[PDB]
């Protein structure tokens, strides 16, 4: 309703860098809010794309941001009669970024890895990797849970079980309130997908430069499966956390698997041991149900609700025609131990190929009426196809079914405005939470400041 679309603030990265591809708010140890921005095609040392991360101080006028530096050099370690190799070219550092406390985690899902041993090898594959920074102290660490030292032939002889070579760890990421980093790795176990978790504190304390293969003992990884419903499900394409079993001591995980079951799609809610508590199935094959997930209580009863995006959903129209517009599903969490039901609300796109539901951001309570609200992106939506973000307000029965406000992309065609979104943080400290919108195709980020409601609704 009350985001201000007149005086925006723009931040900008290098041309071609895809600055804005991912972003998050970051609070320093004194609570000053900044914006961390991933730019997964930023040029590295060999004038080769490797990705990069920027840490943008808040300023109404926006502008350029300093880099948050990470080591971009390929590494080699000859040890235990093997050769370990990391390959950073085109790794897409900054394809995901998240902030927790005063730490920043930025991931490179396509970082490759190989292990040589005489004439054999593991195979050079994208295991992905994450880079952790504490900007104030300069501390750095890394976490790459799918690196292995097993040779190719061993996987063949063992029928490709527990094969974490194509994980793409860091493809998605999230951090629990207690500080457990949770990485989605949709290539995990031969393209089933897996999750990897470890406390941030333990990642820092167990990491040293140059080791390349090291143990994080408190880490926990999900499981392989022989069930074909999971094959090529990309479980972990998106991830989130929240409270779904009534017990405030345990954190539950929400995992999108947009091609689960021969592309039907699914989203699963799991306990922290990866035991499945509920499964939501997509409605339509190939709609990419689970591309995005969001967790927030929208109807003010204190219980977290789940939103799921299916950006390629095809709506039925006149004369047995189908129109690809995208759809968002709202599931309200019921009182006490009970299955999430059918969806409480379906929000459906209007613009052909607009991809409504491609991203969904909790806004906290934008208009301050006591119900949390959300922003849904349609990166190619709007009447001109340039991208729109739509705001939906919470209320006692769930969400309003018509947007209270629509933000049309201020960028040119192709910017993919809305592809990343983050809300619920008050960046200018005026008592209203604000919204940041990435437009990686234009290498920019737009900040929308929430302002006092003009007339309430």
């Amino acid at each position: 309703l009350n985001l201000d679309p007149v005086q925006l603030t723009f931040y900008a990265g290098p041309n071609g860098s895809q600055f804005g591809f991912s972003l998050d708010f970051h609070k320093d140890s004194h609570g000053r809010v900044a914006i961390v921005v991933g730019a997964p095609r930023t040029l590295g040392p060999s004038q080769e794309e490797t990705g990069g991360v920027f840490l943008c101080p808040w300023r109404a006028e926006g502008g350029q941001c300093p880099s948050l530096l990470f080591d971009l050099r390929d590494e080699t370690r000859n040890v235990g009669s093997q050769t370990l190799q990391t390959f950073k070219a085109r790794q897409g550092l900054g394809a995901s970024v998240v902030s927790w406390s005063d730490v920043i985690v930025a991931c490179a899902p396509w970082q490759h890895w190989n292990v040589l041993e005489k004439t054999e090898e593991a195979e050079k594959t994208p295991v992905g990797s994450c880079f952790l920074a504490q900007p104030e102290s300069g501390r750095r660490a890394e976490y790459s849970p799918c690196r292995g030292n097993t040779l190719s032939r061993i996987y063949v002889e063992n029928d490709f079980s527990w094969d974490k070579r194509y994980c793409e760890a860091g493809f998605s990421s999230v951090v629990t309130q207690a500080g457990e980093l949770v990485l989605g790795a949709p290539g995990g176990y031969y393209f089933l997908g897996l999750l990897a978790q470890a406390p941030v504190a333990d990642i820092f304390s167990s990491y040293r430069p140059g080791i390349l293969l090291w143990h994080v003992s408190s880490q926990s990884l999900s499981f392989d499966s022989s069930n074909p419903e999971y094959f090529d499900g990309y479980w972990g394409y998106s991830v989130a956390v929240g409270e779904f079993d009534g017990d405030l001591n345990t954190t539950e995980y929400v995992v999108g698997a947009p091609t689960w079951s021969w592309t039907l799609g699914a989203v699963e809610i799991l306990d922290s041991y990866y035991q499945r508590l509920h499964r939501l199935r997509g409605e339509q094959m190939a709609s990419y149900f689970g591309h995005s997930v969001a967790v927030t209580d929208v109807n003010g009863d204190g219980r977290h609700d789940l939103l799921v995006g299916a950006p390629l959903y095809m709506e039925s129209r006149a004369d047995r025609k189908l129109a690809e517009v995208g759809r968002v599903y709202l599931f309200l969490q019921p009182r006490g131990p009970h299955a999430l039901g059918a969806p409480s609300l379906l929000l459906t796109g209007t613009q052909l190929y607009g991809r409504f539901g491609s991203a969904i951001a909790p806004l906290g309570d934008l208009d301050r009426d006591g119900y949390n609200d959300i922003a849904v992106a349609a990166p190619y939506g709007g009447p001109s196809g340039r991208g729109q973000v739509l705001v939906f307000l919470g209320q006692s029965e769930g969400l309003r079914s018509r947007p209270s406000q629509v933000l049309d992309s201020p960028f040119p065609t192709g910017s993919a405005f809305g592809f990343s979104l983050r809300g619920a943080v008050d960046i200018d400290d005026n008592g209203y939470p604000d919204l940041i919108v990435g437009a990686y195709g234009a290498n920019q980020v737009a900040v929308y400041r929430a302002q006092p409601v003009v007339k309430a609704s």
Partner: antibody, heavy 119, light 108 residues
Framework: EVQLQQSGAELVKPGASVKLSCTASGFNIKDTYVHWVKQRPEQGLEWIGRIDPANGYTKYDPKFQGKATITADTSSNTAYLQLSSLTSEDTAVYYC????????????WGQGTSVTVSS | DILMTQSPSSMSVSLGDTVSITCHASQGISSNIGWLQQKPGKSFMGLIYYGTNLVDGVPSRFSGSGSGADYSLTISSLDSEDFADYYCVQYAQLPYTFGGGTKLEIKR
């Protein structure tokens, strides 16, 4: 807290066999490589081999092939060193070892198990 | 196999001293070396991994340095509990191989 707890002193006859154990306390034996090392006063320290108890795969210094078999059982969180065709020269102290962080290192040691081979 | 020649075999030193034990390898091992301590009639504790990294719990008066084929353990300001045996181990190649050790004894 990681501890490696090895079985008691062994006293055996030339030609017999013996099977030493090393039980993980405070952690899962499956988390890392587990190595076996031999120590004698004159000859000093010698690496026997290792096992990845997750999958049973082993490596040995060739000087010990046929003498030493290293196995593991995640169920009981234990790794084993089995010595065959015992000789006086097998009289030594045996240690199980695992890395701390570095996959390839040798940081945590069991308390040691004396093996004495005599008639 | 890689030979680890450790020196000196022993040294008679005093509390407060700074001493260094060296290790020379028959070929370069790029910091894939560990240092170990064994107190009299006791088991081993790890001190250093990968050339320069303190094992958790080890006091910082211990340090490791070196590169290529030559490495050192240095103990600044010797403590009474430092009079013990020390060994290096290389893990650049299988089989892992050890130095002959060094025993710190008390000067009188």
């Amino acid at each position: 807290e990681v501890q490696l707890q090895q079985s008691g002193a062994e006293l055996v006859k030339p030609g017999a066999s013996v099977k030493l154990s090393c039980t993980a306390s405070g952690f899962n034996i499956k988390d890392t490589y587990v190595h076996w090392v031999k120590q004698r006063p004159e000859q000093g320290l010698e690496w026997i081999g290792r096992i990845d108890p997750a999958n049973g795969y082993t490596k040995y210094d060739p000087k010990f092939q046929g003498k030493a078999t290293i196995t593991a059982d995640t169920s009981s969180n234990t790794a084993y060193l089995q010595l065959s065709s015992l000789t006086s020269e097998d009289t030594a102290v045996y240690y199980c070892v695992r890395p701390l962080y570095d996959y390839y290192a040798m940081d945590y040691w069991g308390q040691g198990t004396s093996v004495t081979v005599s008639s | 196999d890689i030979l680890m020649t450790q020196s000196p075999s022993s040294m008679s030193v005093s509390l407060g001293d700074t001493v260094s034990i060296t290790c020379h390898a028959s070929q370069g091992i790029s910091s894939n070396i560990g240092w170990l301590q064994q107190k009299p009639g006791k088991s081993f504790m790890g001190l250093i991994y990968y050339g320069t990294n303190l094992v958790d719990g080890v006091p910082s008066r211990f340090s490791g340095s070196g590169s290529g084929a030559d490495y050192s353990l240095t103990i600044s300001s010797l403590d009474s509990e430092d009079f013990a045996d020390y060994y290096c181990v290389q893990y650049a190649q299988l089989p892992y191989t050890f130095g002959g050790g060094t025993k710190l004894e008390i000067k009188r």
